[PDB]
Write a protein that binds this ligand. Structure first.
Ligand SMILES: O=C(O)c1ccc[n+]([C@@H]2O[C@H](COP(=O)([O-])O)[C@@H](O)[C@H]2O)c1
Ligand SMILES: O=C(O)c1ccc[n+]([C@@H]2O[C@H](COP(=O)([O-])O)[C@@H](O)[C@H]2O)c1
Ligand SMILES: [Cl-]
Ligand SMILES: [Cl-]
Lengths: 468, 468
C-alpha cells in the first residue's frame, strides 16, 4: 500500500491551488442533514483506517519515486509534489504531521454534527489535510452499515417486545449473509464488523479477524454461526431424494441448531409433507437448544413467511404466549434469508403481528441488503474544509451552493457538545472556546503518525446500545 | 489472507451434508436471465481473484490451526474439516485440486449463459468446489461495473454520433470519481479497473496498480486525469475572493486542461460574470489542448447543465457544427460530475440534444453511481451445483423453486457454443459432447493451483468493444 497513490487524482494538484501563505487547512466530517429517516448515526470504523493506512512510517523514498513515475504518465505532466512528500520523509521519518479528533466509536450522534476533524500540524503540510480526505471518507461505509443494522435492530426490538414481552434472542435475529454479495474481501471484513456492533450472528467470517486485529473483544470471537445447508447439499442428492438429504443433515447435526433450506423444489411441500409428516419424528425429538430452523429462500418474502408458518402451525403443536401471539414448539423455528432489507424486514414483522405470530418464531438473514445496497448519500457522509490560516489570520470558510442549501457546510473551528437537555450540538466559528457548553466530545485519536486513543470492540458495542 | 477463513461460515459444515461416496461436485456461474435491461454482460475480474487468492500454496500448517481455533469458538463446536485440509497440504503442497474453465475476459455474453465452471480434480476434495463459491461469486462486482459502464458508453456513443457525426473523445466522456464513495480500498481498485475496460479517464488511482499487477498494458498506464479544483481549494480564498481563486488556478495550469468547480456559492454568477466577464481574457487565450472545463456540482443535473450552456453560449462564440448542433469554442468545456448514473446520463444527453447542444460540449464524472450503487441482483450473478458423481454415477442436479421460475438452475455438465447464426448458447446435460455445435468456448484458466491461461488488459478492452 502506498498512501501517495491512495487519493483522488485531482488532489495531487491541489497544493498549487490553495491561497499562497496558507499554513493551516482544517477540515471536518459529518453525516449532513437533509431537510426511515436515519436521524442518528453510529460512529464506527475510523480506528481501522488509522491503524491500517495512516499510522507509522507511510512515506519512503521508494514510494515517492513510484508515485512520481505513475503520476508523470497519468497526467502526462509533472505536477506531483515531490518536494512536499520528501519533506515529511526527511523531517518526520515519514510520519504524517496530521491531528485527527473524533467522537468515541460506537457513539450515536444525530445528523448534522461534526464527527471528526483533520488538520495539519506543520505549516509546510497545509496540503496534506485534504490529501487523505479520500481514505478518511471511506468511513461512510462502516458508519452506514452499523447505522442501518441498528435501525433494523430497533424494528426487531419493538415487534419482539410487543409480541413476546421481552427481547430474548434479539442479538441473533439478523444474521449476516453478505459475504458473496459485497464488492471485495476487504469490504466483507469492514461491513461484517460494522454489523457485529449490533448483532452476534454472522456467516461473513472476514469480520472476525478484523475485530480481533484492530479493536479486540474479551470474548474469543465477536460473532457466531450454526451449521446450515445450501442448495448444493440438498440438490446433490437428486430431486427424488430431498427427504433423504433432509434426514441425513438433521441427523448429522442432531445436537446443535441446524438450518435447512427447504425451497429447492417446493417449499410448501417440504414444510407440510417432508418435515410435517415423513420426518416429523426427527424434529419433535430435538432439544430446545438445538432446533430445526427451516429456511425458505424464494417467493414473496412476507407471503412465503406467512404461508410457511400457517403450514407448520397445522402440523406442529402451537401455543399462545402471554401476549396472545402464536408460538411454534421450541424445537422448530424459521429463518427468512431472501429479500431482506430494512424495508421488507418491517413489512414482514408487521405482517406476522397482524396474523398473530410472535416474532420469537423467526430470524432473518440479509446479505446484499445488509452490506452492499448502501451508498454515501444515504447519510450524506461528507468531508469539507471549514477553517484555514493564511498570512497568519484564521478565516472561516464554507460552501453554500445557490441551488442546494442542503450542501451548505459549517464555518470555522468546530466542536461537539452536550446541550443542557442532554442532546448534541456542534459549535461553529471557534465558539466552543467560550466554554458555555461543557467539554468538547471530540478526542485526539491520531497525531503525528501515532494513534493516541483507541476503543475496544466491547466499548463500541456498549456505546451503540439501544435505549430500551 | 487465509482461504480457510474466506468462506461463508455454513460452508465449513457442508462436507458432512453431501451424499456419501460423492467424488465430484461440479458448479457453474451465470448472470441469470430475469424473465436498461442489461441483456449482455462483460466477463471481467476472475483473473484477479485467481492470482491474488487461489493460486499457489494457499494452505499451510499455521492456516489450518488458525482456522481450527477460530471455528471452534465461532460454532462452539468442532465441525471444521481439519483432515480434509490437511490432505491438500500433504498431497498437493497446499495447492487447490480444482479446475476452473472460463469464457475469455472482456467477452460480451448474453444473460443466461455459463461464464465459468468449477470442479474438484481429486475425489477426496469433493467439498472444495463450493468452499470457494463465496470468493468466486465476488466476480459479480467487476462484471457489473464493467457492464454498467459499457452500457453508459453505448448511450454516449449514440448521442455523440448523432450530434457530432463521429466518436472523437468518447473514451474520456465518463470519468471515474468513485474513490471516496466505495466501501474499501480493495473495492476502489477492482471497480476502477472494471470501468477502465471501457474508458480512459479516472481519478481512482487504485485502479492503475491493479491492472499493472494482474493484467498488463502495453502503455505505461491504463488511465489518465487532468488537474482539477475541489471546494476546499476555491473556498479557502474566502467567499469574496472566488475570482482570485479561479484566476490563480487557471494561471497555474495554463497549458494543460484544467477543471474548476464553479458552484461554491452561485454557479450561474460564476459562469456569467466571473468566467464570462471578469476572467474571460484568461479563457479565450487558451489552447485547444488545454481547455477550461467548468464543473457544476449541485442542483438538478439536467436543468443545471442546460442553464450553464445557455449562459456560456451568450458570453462565448458558439458555432454550429456540421450536424446542426451548437458547439462552444475549443478552449471551453463542461463536466457534470454530480448526480450522474446511467439513468440521469441518458436524461442529460437527450435534453442537450433537444436544445440543439452537441455532446462534444460535455463530459461526465460519476462516483457512487459508477462504482458503489450496484448489487449482485442487477445481473443476477449466481453460482450453483449442476452435476455430481456419487457411487461412480454422474447425476444432473438443479434447483427449481415453485414460487420463482427465475431461480431455476441449469442441469448437468455445461458448455458454451456459437450458434449457426453466430450467437451464444449454453448446452446442458453434457450435450456439448455430441459436437453438434462445434467446440466449447470455455478455456481452462486454473488447474491444481496454477493459472493456465490469462489475458492482457489490452486484449480485454478489445473483446469488450462496442459494435459501432
Ligand atoms: O444460510 C446461510 O447460512 C447463508 C449464508 C450466506 C448466504 N446465504 C444465502 O445466500 C444468498 C445471498 O443473497 P443476497 O441477495 O442477500 O446477497 C441468500 O439466498 C442467502 O440465504 C445463506
Ligand atoms: O473533479 C474531480 O476530479 C473529482 C474527483 C473525485 C471526486 N469528485 C467529486 O466528488 C463527488 C463524488 O460524489 P458521488 O456521489 O458521485 O460519489 C462529486 O461531487 C464529484 O464531482 C471530483
Ligand atoms: Cl444458500
Ligand atoms: Cl470536489
Amino acid at each position: 500500500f502506498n498512501i501517495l497513490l491512495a487519493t483522488d487524482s485531482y488532489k495531487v494538484t491541489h497544493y498549487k491551488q490553495y491561497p499562497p501563505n496558507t499554513s493551516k487547512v482544517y477540515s471536518y466530517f459529518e453525516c449532513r442533514e437533509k431537510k426511515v429517516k436515519y436521524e442518528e448515526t453510529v460512529f464506527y470504523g475510523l480506528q481501522y483506517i488509522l491503524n491500517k493506512y495512516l499510522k507509522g512510517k507511510v512515506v519512503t523514498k521508494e514510494k515517492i519515486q513510484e508515485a512520481k513515475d505513475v503520476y508523470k504518465e497519468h497526467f502526462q505532466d509533472d505536477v506531483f509534489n515531490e518536494k512536499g512528500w520528501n519533506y515529511i520523509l526527511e523531517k518526520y521519518d515519514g510520519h504524517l504531521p496530521i491531528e485527527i479528533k473524533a467522537v468515541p466509536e460506537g457513539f450515536v450522534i444525530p445528523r448534522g454534527n461534526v464527527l471528526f476533524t483533520v488538520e495539519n500540524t506543520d505549516p509546510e503540510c497545509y496540503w496534506l489535510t485534504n490529501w487523505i480526505e479520500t481514505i478518511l471518507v471511506q468511513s461512510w461505509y462502516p458508519i452506514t452499515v452499523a447505522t442501518n443494522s441498528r435501525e433494523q435492530k430497533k424494528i426487531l426490538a419493538k415487534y419482539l417486545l410487543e409480541t413476546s414481552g421481552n427481547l430474548d434472542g434479539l442479538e441473533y435475529k439478523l444474521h449476516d449473509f453478505g459475504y458473496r454479495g459485497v464488492s471485495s474481501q476487504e469490504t466483507a471484513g469492514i461491513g461484517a464488523s460494522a454489523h457485529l456492533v449490533n448483532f452476534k450472528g454472522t456467516d461473513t467470517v472476514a469480520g472476525l479477524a478484523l475485530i480481533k486485529k484492530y479493536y479486540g473483544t474479551k470474548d474469543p470471537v465477536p460473532g457466531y454461526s450454526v451449521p446450515a445447508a445450501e442448495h448444493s447439499t440438498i440438490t446433490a442428492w437428486g430431486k427424488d431424494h430431498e427427504k433423504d438429504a433432509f434426514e441425513h443433515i438433521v441427523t448429522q447435526f442432531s445436537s446443535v441448531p441446524v438450518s435447512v433450506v427447504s425451497d429447492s423444489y417446493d417449499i410448501y411441500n417440504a414444510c407440510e409433507k417432508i418435515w410435517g409428516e415423513d420426518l416429523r419424528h426427527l424434529i419433535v425429538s430435538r432439544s430446545t437448544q438445538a432446533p430445526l430452523i427451516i429456511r425458505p429462500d424464494s417467493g414473496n418474502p412476507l407471503d412465503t413467511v406467512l404461508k410457511v408458518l400457517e403450514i407448520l402451525g397445522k402440523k406442529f403443536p402451537v401455543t399462545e404466549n402471554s401476549k396472545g401471539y402464536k408460538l411454534l414448539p421450541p424445537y422448530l423455528r424459521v429463518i427468512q434469508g431472501d429479500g431482506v432489507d430494512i424495508n421488507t424486514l418491517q413489512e414482514i414483522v408487521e405482517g406476522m403481528k397482524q396474523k398473530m405470530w410472535s416474532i420469537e418464531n423467526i430470524a432473518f438473514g440479509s446479505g446484499g441488503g445488509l452490506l452492499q445496497k448502501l451508498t454515501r448519500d444515504l447519510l450524506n457522509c461528507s468531508f469539507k474544509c471549514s477553517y484555514v490560516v493564511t498570512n497568519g489570520l484564521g478565516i472561516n470558510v464554507f460552501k453554500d451552493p445557490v441551488a442546494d442549501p442542503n450542501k451548505r457546510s459549517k464555518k470555522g473551528r468546530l466542536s461537539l457538545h452536550r446541550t443542557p437537555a442532554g442532546n448534541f450540538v456542534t459549535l461553529e466559528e471557534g465558539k466552543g472556546d467560550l466554554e458555555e457548553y461543557g467539554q468538547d466530545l471530540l478526542h485526539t485519536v491520531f497525531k503525528n503518525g501515532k494513534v493516541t486513543k483507541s476503543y475496544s470492540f466491547d466499548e463500541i458495542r456498549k456505546n451503540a446500545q439501544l435505549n430500551i
